[PDB]
Design a protein around this ligand. Sequence first.
Ligand SMILES: C[S@@H](CCCN)C[C@H]1O[C@@H](n2cnc3c(N)ncnc32)[C@H](O)[C@@H]1O
Ligand SMILES: C[S@@H](CCCN)C[C@H]1O[C@@H](n2cnc3c(N)ncnc32)[C@H](O)[C@@H]1O
Ligand SMILES: O=C(CCS)Nc1ccccc1
Ligand SMILES: O=C(CCS)Nc1ccccc1
Lengths: 273, 278
Amino acid sequence: GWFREENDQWPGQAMSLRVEKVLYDAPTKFQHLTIFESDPKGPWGTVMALDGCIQVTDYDEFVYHEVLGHTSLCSHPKPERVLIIGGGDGGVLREVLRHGTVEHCDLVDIDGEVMEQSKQHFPQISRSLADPRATVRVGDGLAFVRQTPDNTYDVVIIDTEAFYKDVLRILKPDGICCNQGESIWLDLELIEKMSRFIRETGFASVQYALMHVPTYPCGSIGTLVCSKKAGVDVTKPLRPVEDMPFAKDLKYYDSEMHKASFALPRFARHINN
Amino acid sequence: ELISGGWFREENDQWPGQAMSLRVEKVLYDAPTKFQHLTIFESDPKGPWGTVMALDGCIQVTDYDEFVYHEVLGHTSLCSHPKPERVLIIGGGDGGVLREVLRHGTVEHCDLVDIDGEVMEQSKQHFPQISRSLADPRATVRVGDGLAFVRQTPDNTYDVVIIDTEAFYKDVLRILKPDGICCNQGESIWLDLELIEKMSRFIRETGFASVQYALMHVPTYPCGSIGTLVCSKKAGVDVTKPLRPVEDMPFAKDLKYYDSEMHKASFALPRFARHINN
Ligand SMILES: C[S@@H](CCCN)C[C@H]1O[C@@H](n2cnc3c(N)ncnc32)[C@H](O)[C@@H]1O
Ligand SMILES: C[S@@H](CCCN)C[C@H]1O[C@@H](n2cnc3c(N)ncnc32)[C@H](O)[C@@H]1O
Ligand SMILES: O=C(CCS)Nc1ccccc1
Ligand SMILES: O=C(CCS)Nc1ccccc1
């Protein structure tokens, strides 16, 4: 049969993939979690959906994982302690762990079932979950950051007021925050709203980086990249990845794509000023 | 044979196991032309897509993201040339590239050849924002094979050739002036990276001095992006930095996707694809 994806907000279209083998399909305590192998004659491999929205495919998971992971960290002078909220597939953490500067990373994900299913059906994404520089919790990020002290983390990556206020609060003075931002084609209003809320919460700067992800609606998604410190230009890498030893293992991210990600179509450019 | 209230479904033989579909609100055209199947319909009015054109079952234009591809092709090429006075567009029957090229004050004449006169007719009726350029008298619009058209054209006729569709590419090189720019509808770095590598190498070997691939976000196309090979007949020219920035022309603010920053960023490729460009 077929997995069909559609959206009541964008009513008259759908996107479908052939299911070759259902590997998981159950409610969880927090969301519907579907994993299946897609057409072995196609490129998508294993696919994971949450409440019927594709979240991860074998084919392009590298895109969003490297952009969040390295755009943020390469914007920091020396990132040693890292929080990931959500990110339970482990992909971002894998990308975080490539950085030698990283001493420790906590990863907090509301949904234990996601990580378990990930270890089972996404080995190349989940390996990183048992790494000794990581600690993995099953819990609400909202609570977790409310119970975290000031000046704890150099980087907070949010891969899903008092929340945004807390995040600024837990970052050190050169803190860098990034999130999974939405689509400039479907959520532009909401991107504008967030950008400005995030800034009025007390972050010095907020800049939106666009990336190409084929399996997400409209072919792209972005991340808001936010600096606690004033005078920081996140759009030009602070510490290029080309000097670190893992650069040539990356399949999407480099310094030219860093810079380029912040050039927006004219209709959307007002997000970045 | 499509009917209002049903869904248009597209699949591909070549990438089995995916499908894409749009609800049809009203059929405005659905018949074979002497060249291809041409489908036009209004999509769901509670959605953003407006009117939609399909050729042989591949969507080609929607009201929605129309401007991306047309502006990228018109402007990346024209802003890479010192003085584009005479322009040829092969394909482009809908009028979209031509509306972008005609924005430019230096353009003195533009010929467009598209093999299917029906595409041009139905664009006149159903895409007024795209096709108004087609009646412009700085343009000459012929129905004809672009291949036979370039073959019958003398050397160094054009400053810029835009292909919106080996003996062909050599003709293209021949009909351009020493200063010429050619750009085309490239394919996708996700679906035909090998093809893009091959086209580029051989456009170079044909005799073009440089060829660089420009990536753009088009949400209605397979995998949500597509590209254009931007090729310079003369040596030592860098198409990846605007020769004549659009920001110095009167119409810069009318554009919805393209500007100089977008121009430079479009040549940055994800690492797996960057060898196309070096
Ligand atoms: C799958 S991941 C997105 C895929 C790209 N790596 C989205 C994760 O965020 C979690 N999530 C959602 N809400 C929360 C909260 N409130 N806290 C923590 N994690 C959360 C959710 O369980 C997904 O695993
Ligand atoms: C509609 S346009 C594609 C959408 C981008 N605006 C593609 C056009 O190329 C024409 N086409 C295809 N082959 C040729 C040749 N050989 N010559 C000229 N025009 C051609 C075809 O009729 C379409 O209208
Ligand atoms: O636009 C989308 C999906 C996300 S924007 N689908 C689509 C619409 C028209 C044509 C082809 C695809
Ligand atoms: O990946 C693709 C198409 C081209 S890259 N489609 C798709 C992705 C997710 C769900 C349904 C379809």
